[PDB]
Design an enzyme around this catalytic site. Structure first.
Site, PDB file in Angstrom:
ATOM      1  N   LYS A 116       0.826  -1.198   0.000  1.00  0.00           N
ATOM      2  CA  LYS A 116       0.000   0.000   0.000  1.00  0.00           C
ATOM      3  C   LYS A 116       0.864   1.253   0.000  1.00  0.00           C
ATOM      4  O   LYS A 116       1.899   1.347   0.671  1.00  0.00           O
ATOM      5  CB  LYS A 116      -0.915   0.041   1.218  1.00  0.00           C
ATOM      6  CG  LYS A 116      -1.716  -1.229   1.426  1.00  0.00           C
ATOM      7  CD  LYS A 116      -2.733  -1.017   2.525  1.00  0.00           C
ATOM      8  CE  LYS A 116      -3.301  -2.313   3.040  1.00  0.00           C
ATOM      9  NZ  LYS A 116      -4.361  -1.948   4.025  1.00  0.00           N
ATOM     10  N   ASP A 137     -13.403   3.447   9.946  1.00  0.00           N
ATOM     11  CA  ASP A 137     -13.752   2.840   8.695  1.00  0.00           C
ATOM     12  C   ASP A 137     -13.836   1.323   8.702  1.00  0.00           C
ATOM     13  O   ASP A 137     -13.565   0.670   7.673  1.00  0.00           O
ATOM     14  CB  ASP A 137     -12.766   3.328   7.623  1.00  0.00           C
ATOM     15  CG  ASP A 137     -13.421   3.440   6.260  1.00  0.00           C
ATOM     16  OD1 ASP A 137     -12.687   3.436   5.239  1.00  0.00           O
ATOM     17  OD2 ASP A 137     -14.675   3.553   6.228  1.00  0.00           O
ATOM     18  N   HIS A 180     -15.903  -1.061   8.025  1.00  0.00           N
ATOM     19  CA  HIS A 180     -17.100  -1.531   7.379  1.00  0.00           C
ATOM     20  C   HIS A 180     -17.048  -3.026   7.097  1.00  0.00           C
ATOM     21  O   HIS A 180     -16.039  -3.714   7.343  1.00  0.00           O
ATOM     22  CB  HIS A 180     -17.331  -0.751   6.057  1.00  0.00           C
ATOM     23  CG  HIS A 180     -16.135  -0.723   5.178  1.00  0.00           C
ATOM     24  ND1 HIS A 180     -15.642  -1.857   4.569  1.00  0.00           N
ATOM     25  CD2 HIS A 180     -15.295   0.282   4.843  1.00  0.00           C
ATOM     26  CE1 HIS A 180     -14.542  -1.556   3.902  1.00  0.00           C
ATOM     27  NE2 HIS A 180     -14.306  -0.262   4.053  1.00  0.00           N
ATOM     28  N   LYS A 185     -16.516  -4.860   4.513  1.00  0.00           N
ATOM     29  CA  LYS A 185     -15.488  -5.474   3.694  1.00  0.00           C
ATOM     30  C   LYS A 185     -14.148  -5.595   4.414  1.00  0.00           C
ATOM     31  O   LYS A 185     -13.209  -6.209   3.878  1.00  0.00           O
ATOM     32  CB  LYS A 185     -15.377  -4.709   2.358  1.00  0.00           C
ATOM     33  CG  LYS A 185     -16.614  -5.026   1.478  1.00  0.00           C
ATOM     34  CD  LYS A 185     -16.578  -4.373   0.119  1.00  0.00           C
ATOM     35  CE  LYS A 185     -15.300  -4.669  -0.645  1.00  0.00           C
ATOM     36  NZ  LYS A 185     -15.347  -5.963  -1.357  1.00  0.00           N
ATOM     37  N   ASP A 189      -6.539  -3.808   7.197  1.00  0.00           N
ATOM     38  CA  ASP A 189      -6.906  -2.445   6.769  1.00  0.00           C
ATOM     39  C   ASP A 189      -7.274  -1.574   7.977  1.00  0.00           C
ATOM     40  O   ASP A 189      -8.351  -0.967   8.049  1.00  0.00           O
ATOM     41  CB  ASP A 189      -8.054  -2.447   5.757  1.00  0.00           C
ATOM     42  CG  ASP A 189      -7.672  -3.075   4.426  1.00  0.00           C
ATOM     43  OD1 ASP A 189      -6.467  -3.285   4.164  1.00  0.00           O
ATOM     44  OD2 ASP A 189      -8.601  -3.361   3.632  1.00  0.00           O
TER      45      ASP A 189
END
Ligand SMILES: [Cl-]
EC number: 2.7.11.1
Length: 396
Positions: free
Chosen positions: A151, A268, A270, A272, A291
């Site tokens: 990343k 964040d 969520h 996924k 993540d």
């Protein structure tokens, strides 16, 4: 218009894209015959006939980045026939998340520092992957898999942010991947070890492990990954984890991770951001968490206040839901555990463990930070975690 689906060296079935645009999938007979057969997704159960539900399209669409900007880049990169998912997977589907290899031995190319820099500069946060061999980064040949998700910075310090968060999570007992900060020339990137890959004992074969995220497991499009859009939250996931081959552990770990996200201001998380390994037979269990980024380093950057930070998946509140990190206290986690039938003694243990271990974990993480690690990231995260940690130490 067919893409053969392989799971390592075994043919699973075929994805078909009809002339009207509809997407269908059909398992291979030889796949279905194995006593160890498993579905490509819990949303695409093993069957002999063609599967035509929207779950097919949604499943494959979920293997691709959600951002339209990133998809346009992919088209450009490989001159993809179009922006369509089937066409994108026709170009990049050889190495995907999980074990799904889409085709229309072990060998690689070592990259020099100069070459690695060039490769990474090419990559609206689009991630890539590389194969690590010893202390070298490499591009795998053929269907040889990658071992790490790479990343780039988003939030200009997102690489450092995530590195810190993953280190802290590991120090606090959470199941997370190891990661390392890599530097190639002027590029600073995060290399996260993949948990959907496993070397065999002799290190002669690198295998892919099947996995899918929560949107996939429930047959949902990435568009509803957030709870406010109708996506799954803590209740639905905890109910789903009851069918896990590791239910007790997975539910405990998932609840512990909700407390962790609150402590580190991860806003964040969520649907996924959670996945399950699909195992032989079709059983499943939670994969490590991933993540992970704290919103604390963004505070004050422009006008974003700590009172503006909200959990993506809310907790129970006396009058509805509790979402503001700044307003959340232990009572919200305990009330949530109760309605979800998560043993109170366990929620207490989770809260108690963070209460006494956080101070030491924060100090311990510092030794694993490189000399050039940005202090503003440590200060912003450490200071805010300690502030919230006080709420635990006061009760536990
Ligand atoms: Cl709230």
């Amino acid at each position: 218009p067919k893409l053969v689906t392989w799971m390592n060296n075994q043919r699973v079935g075929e994805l078909t894209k009809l002339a009207n645009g509809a997407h269908t999938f059909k398992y291979a007979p030889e796949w279905l015959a194995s006593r160890y057969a498993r579905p490509l997704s819990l949303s695409l159960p093993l069957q002999r006939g063609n599967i035509t539900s929207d779950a097919v399209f949604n499943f494959f669409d979920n293997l691709l980045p959600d951002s339209p900007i990133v998809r346009d880049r992919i088209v450009k990169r490989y001159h993809a026939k179009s922006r369509q998912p089937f066409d994108l997977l026709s170009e990049i589907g050889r190495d995907s998340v999980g074990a799904v290899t889409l085709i229309p031995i072990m060998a690689w190319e070592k990259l020099t520092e100069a070459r690695l820099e060039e490769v990474l500069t090419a990559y609206a946060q689009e991630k890539t992957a590389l194969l690590r061999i010893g202390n070298d980064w490499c591009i795998p040949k053929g269907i040889t898999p990658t071992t790490h998700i790479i990343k780039l910075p988003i939030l200009s310090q997102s690489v450092d942010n995530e590195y810190y968060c993953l280190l802290l999570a590991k120090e606090l007992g959470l199941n997370v991947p190891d990661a390392e900060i890599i530097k190639a020339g002027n590029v600073r990137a995060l290399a996260v070890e993949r948990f959907d890959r496993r070397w065999n004992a002799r290190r002669t074969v690198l295998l892919r492990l099947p996995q899918e995220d929560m949107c996939q497991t429930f047959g949902l499009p990435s568009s509803v990954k957030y709870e406010s859009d109708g996506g799954p939250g803590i209740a639905r996931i905890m109910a789903f984890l009851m069918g896990s081959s590791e239910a007790l552990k997975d539910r405990y770990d998932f609840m512990k991770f909700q407390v962790f996200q609150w402590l580190i201001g991860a806003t964040d998380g969520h649907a996924k951001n959670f996945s399950v390994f699909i195992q032989a037979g079709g059983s499943y269990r939670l994969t490590p968490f991933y993540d992970i980024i704290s919103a604390f380093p963004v505070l004050g950057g422009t006008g974003i206040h700590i009172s503006d930070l909200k959990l993506a998946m809310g907790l129970n509140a006396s009058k509805g839901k509790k979402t503001a990190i700044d307003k959340i206290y232990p009572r919200h986690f305990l009330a949530t555990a109760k309605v979800l039938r998560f043993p109170e003694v366990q929620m207490h243990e989770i809260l108690s463990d963070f209460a006494r271990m956080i101070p030491a974990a924060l100090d311990n993480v510092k030794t694993s930070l490189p000399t050039d690690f940005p202090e503003n990231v440590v200060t912003a995260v450490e200071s805010n975690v300690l502030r919230l940690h006080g709420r635990l130490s006061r009760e536990y």
